[PDB]
Amino acid sequence: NLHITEKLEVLAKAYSVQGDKWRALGYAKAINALKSFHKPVTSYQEACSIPGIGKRMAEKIIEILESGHLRKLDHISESVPVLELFSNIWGAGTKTAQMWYQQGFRSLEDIRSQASLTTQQAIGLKHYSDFLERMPREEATEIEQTVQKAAQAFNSGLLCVACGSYRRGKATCGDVDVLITHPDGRSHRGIFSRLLDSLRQEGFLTDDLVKGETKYLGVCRLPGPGRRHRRLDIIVVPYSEFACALLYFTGSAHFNRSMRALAKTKGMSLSEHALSTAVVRNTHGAKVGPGRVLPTPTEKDVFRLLGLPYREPAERDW
DNA sequence: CGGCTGTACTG
DNA sequence: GCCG
Ligand SMILES: [Mg+2]
Ligand code: NA
């Protein structure tokens, strides 16, 4: 199924970029369902059947089948392509894009010349094209290795794992996500600092976007002709959290959200730090009592404790 | 009626 | 947008 989704994707993005996040979530989930459906969809009654598809989406499917068109798609605001242009700048989202629009900016030349950018947005605009591009998974390999090689030059016992789409076995990667830990659980942050320093000194790191104590995002470029600037995310964790970190950083993101949402129905909470149980939540679903951390030395343990069958990373790409 | 994941960083 |  891609006949009807292609038309939905355009509404999903229109909604997302105008900041209607939940309606856009509705569309996103429906789109997902339709894609993992075996056969093409035939009846409005078959429509409702599919979890993630209700009356409103059913009617729209019907129109796509009956008319081969979507009336809502010709009513999309003329501002949408511009809002998408703007929020493809790293560091600029829905609010900033809509503000810029209101203020009369219609193009990246307008932003470049007339807009006051944060440090992150200026780096984002500089790399606008490169950030929209995916790298072959083989290039990800060279980057993980460059990072790993450099880390292991401080403390050779450090473990570096490439995560995200790479670990899920995808042929291309939007960025490289490197997870760093140490088996003693005591080795952190003296490294993470100096590590970035050498990588920056080797000329490998071109720009910094986020520098936190355990988390880094920046821009690197491998040496040589024909190389593009790439996004590189690095996080350091204590060995205690290694498995929950690995699970999180590997994703996919829709998978993390599904997992976490299930954990919530079981009175549990899952995050990059821990899976914990006996979590106390107020009526709005917000966490109040922290509950207690459940032991989780491997990804297997996390699935198990949730009552789920183990998925290897490739089966996580939702 | 109202949640839809949970966390971190920046200014 | 969908659903419990
Ligand atoms: Mg990634
Ligand atoms: Na952005």
Side-chain angles (χ1 to χ4, degrees), chain A residues 40 57 73 132-133 193 214 290 304:
Chain A
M57 288 290 287
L73 289 196
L132 284 170
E133 222 184 353
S193 154
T214 62
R304 177 171 62 70

Side-chain angles (χ1 to χ4, degrees), chain A residues 134 163-166 168 173-177 231 233 249:
Chain A
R134 286 182 79 79
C163 299
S165 53
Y166 179 90
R168 301 200 306 277
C173 304
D175 56 24
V176 191
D177 300 302
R231 278 184 288 154
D233 292 279
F249 219 12

Side-chain angles (χ1 to χ4, degrees), chain A residues 106-148 150-152:
Chain A
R106 306 279 182 274
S107 83
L108 293 185
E109 179 50 26
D110 295 346
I111 299 299
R112 178 195 75 67
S113 59
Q114 293 167 265
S116 74
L117 304 164
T118 59
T119 311
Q120 296 176 329
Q121 295 160 343
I123 291 160
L125 173 58
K126 171 195 323 167
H127 306 289
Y128 191 87
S129 288
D130 276 344
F131 288 2
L132 284 170
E133 222 184 353
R134 286 182 79 79
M135 78 190 78
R137 80 167 274 120
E138 291 75 23
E139 183 177 344
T141 296
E142 314 180 49
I143 287 165
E144 189 266 337
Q145 257 162 53
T146 304
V147 162
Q148 185 197 149
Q152 305 198 339

